Design a protein around this nucleic acid. Structure first.
Ligand SMILES: Nc1ccn([C@@H]2CS[C@H](COP(=O)(O)OP(=O)(O)O)O2)c(=O)n1
Ligand SMILES: [Ca+2]
Ligand SMILES: [Ca+2]
Ligand SMILES: [Ca+2]
Length: 341
DNA sequence: GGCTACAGGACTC
DNA sequence: CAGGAGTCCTGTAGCC
């Protein structure tokens, strides 16, 4: 198989520049303002000019400002970025019927039936890059390899505005050398453990006893790493169908008083229903982010679709459950709907 | 034993 | 000083 993965560069920030070219050359930080106080909130992303200096997704806005007080801080305008994203995805659809839209920012294309080899694949990549540039003036990075994992890794290595191929031989190389923490799906926790029995690289999962790997990280993850190490990983590029839709908001102050939380919970329900559009869910979960930043949830599944009215009453019951079984105070509250008809 | 629901864990962008 | 959205896996307990 030949997979070509596309990753839009610093997407949110770049869209902002496209819309306001004077931002070009400046550090731009896209933020999610929470409303608690002057600049409370976090960074969603930032462009290369801000990133070179340590401004990264997730850090507090206030901290980012300590680092770059004269950078341009803009509020996230997701609806805008989604519109630009949709237009770009449609352009990619022209290069292949088998396409997987992984997120607002990434897409995987199985171009096996399009090119006979990596030379042609690379050229196809150039072609896509230029098309996107000429139509939307957005730069992207292309990664090409035998499966999704290594195509993604390829682009991680080449961004921004790059393109890169990883042949069978580098796959083998990578398997020996590549930091196993740099493998998609391996986070700090998990990595700690694999760079905890000398597994420091993919190849190491092959020699370790299996029940050992699996005792640390679980069966699915071990299998996954092993399959990659054997260079036998294969996952089909398939149309992604949304499985849940929800909304979560940060409350002005923490609380565990029901009447004080309700308004937030209710607004989250309203916005969620809106996004549902024509989908009818049978399951509803109320999600709470506690004062220590821990996540708790309670859900219920019905044998029929959930009306907005049933959503309202059922959410209050689930929220009560949360409160009555966790003595912590809540900081963020939302709902997530799933199991669509 | 293995399938279901549910709740927590971990990861990704 | 810590926002928003979405996915997959796993432990536990009921049930066949
Ligand atoms: N913690 C995060 C991480 C990422 N994002 C969003 C999701 S889509 C948007 C894309 O930004 P970039 O292209 O700058 O991110 P990278 O592709 O470089 O990782 O980043 C976000 O909102 N919060
Ligand atoms: Ca990305
Ligand atoms: Ca990106
Ligand atoms: Ca990692």
């Amino acid at each position: 198989m030949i997979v070509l993965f596309v990753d839009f560069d610093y997407f949110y920030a770049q869209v902002e520049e496209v819309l306001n070219p004077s931002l070009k050359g400046k550090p731009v930080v896209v933020c999610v303002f929470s409303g608690r106080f002057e600049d409370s909130g976090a960074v969603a992303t930032a462009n290369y000019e801000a990133r070179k200096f340590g401004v990264k997704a997730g850090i507090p806005i206030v901290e980012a400002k300590k680092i770059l007080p004269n950078a341009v801080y803009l509020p996230m305008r997701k609806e805008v970025y989604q519109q630009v994203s949709s237009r770009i995805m449609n352009l990619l659809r022209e290069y292949s019927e088998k396409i997987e839209i992984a997120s607002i920012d990434e897409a995987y294309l199985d171009i096996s039936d399009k090119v006979r080899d990596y030379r042609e694949a690379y050229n196809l990549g150039l072609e896509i890059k230029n098309k996107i540039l000429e139509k939307e003036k957005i730069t992207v990075t292309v990664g090409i390899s035998k499966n999704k994992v290594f195509a993604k890794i390829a682009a991680d290595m080449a961004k921004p505005n790059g393109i890169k191929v990883i042949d069978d031989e580098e796959v083998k190389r990578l398997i020996r050398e590549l930091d196993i923490a740099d493998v998609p799906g391996i986070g700090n926790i998990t990595a700690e453990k694999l760079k905890k029995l000398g597994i420091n690289k993919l190849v190491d999962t092959l020699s370790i006893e299996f029940d050992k790997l699996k005792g640390m990280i679980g069966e699915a993850k071990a299998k996954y790493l092993i399959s990659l190490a054997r260079d036998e990983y294969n996952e089909p590029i398939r149309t992604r169908v949304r499985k849940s839709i929800g909304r979560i908001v940060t409350m002005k102050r923490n609380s565990r008083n029901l009447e004080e939380i309700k308004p937030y919970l209710f607004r989250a329900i309203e916005e969620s229903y809106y996004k549902l559009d024509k989908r009818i869910p049978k399951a509803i979960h109320v999600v709470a982010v506690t004062e220590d930043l821990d996540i708790v949830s309670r859900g219920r599944t019905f044998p029929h679709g959930i009306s907005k009215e049933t959503a309202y009453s059922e959410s209050v019951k689930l929220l009560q459950k949360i409160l009555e079984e966790d003595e912590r105070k809540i900081r963020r509250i939302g709902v997530r709907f799933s199991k669509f008809i």
